[PDB]
Amino acid sequence: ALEICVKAAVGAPDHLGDCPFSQRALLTLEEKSLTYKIHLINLSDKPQWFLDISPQGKVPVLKIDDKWVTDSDVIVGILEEKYPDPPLKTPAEFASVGSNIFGTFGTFLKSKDSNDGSEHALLVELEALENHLKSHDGPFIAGERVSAVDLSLAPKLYHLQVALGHFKSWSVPESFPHVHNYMKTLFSLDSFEKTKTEEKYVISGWAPKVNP
Numbered sequence: 001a002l003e004i005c006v007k008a009a010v011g012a013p014d015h016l017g018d019c020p021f022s023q024r025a026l027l028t029l030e031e032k033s034l035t036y037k038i039h040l041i042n043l044s045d046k047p048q049w050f051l052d053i054s055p056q057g058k059v060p061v062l063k064i065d066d067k068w069v070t071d072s073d074v075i076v077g078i079l080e081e082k083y084p085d086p087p088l089k090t091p092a093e094f095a096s097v098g099s100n101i102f103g104t105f106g107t108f109l110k111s112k113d114s115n116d117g118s119e120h121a122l123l124v125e126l127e128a129l130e131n132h133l134k135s136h137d138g139p140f141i142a143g144e145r146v147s148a149v150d151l152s153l154a155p156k157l158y159h160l161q162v163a164l165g166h167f168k169s170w171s172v173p174e175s176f177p178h179v180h181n182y183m184k185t186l187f188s189l190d191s192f193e194k195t196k197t198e199e200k201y202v203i204s205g206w207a208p209k210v211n212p
């Protein structure tokens with residue numbers, strides 16, 4: 001009986017919160033059509049039973065074969081092994097595409113100094129993604145079907161869109177049309193729609209972190 005601990009929404013602990021690592025795991029569970037129970041963990045008031053099975057107090061955590069396993073990388077790899085069909089393996093050459101976007105996004109979101117180069121560093125990572133997407137068959141990073149890299153990136157690109165839009169009135173430039181198309185593709189996946197955090201909870205999640 002699979003169970004997953006994920007972040008509860010800031011300000012509404014009975015709703016799904018905004019952890020993109022948790023969403024990567026939920027996406028994988030859904031793309032594998034698996035049944036599972038969700039535990040919403042209020043990270044500002046962690047329950048004791050959760051601390052007892054997540055030694056670092058982090059989410060996500062998956063209960064499988066009666067062991068609780070941390071780290072969304074490990075969780076999605078174990079699911080891929082245990083439930084091989086349909087396959088989500090991304091060819092190795094593409095498995096790190098987009099991998100620096102989320103970090104550059106967070107640095108730009110938190111920047112107070114518009115000459116510190118943070119916008120440019122994000123635009124460089126977006127350009128790398130545009131360059132991959134315009135030169136390889138789509139609609140996903142590895143072609144016709146969604147795979148692990150897309151499931152890792154989708155929640156992160158959603159944060160980028162919602163948070164930079166709301167906090168900075170900033171959106172991915174229209175000069176990256178492939179990135180725009182790719183985001184639309186990911187956000188309209190049935191699995192994405194089912195597992196997504198409401199925008200207002202991406203906002204509440206980030207608000208206390210933007211400018212500590």
Ligand SMILES: N[C@@H](CCC(=O)N[C@@H](CS)C(=O)NCC(=O)O)C(=O)O
Pocket residue numbers: 007018019020021043044057058059060070071072073
């Ligand atoms: N690398 C871990 C990252 C997990 C992580 O950073 N989770 C955050 C929520 S997004 C967390 O549990 N933070 C603990 C806290 O804020 O108290 C993974 O991929 O699972």
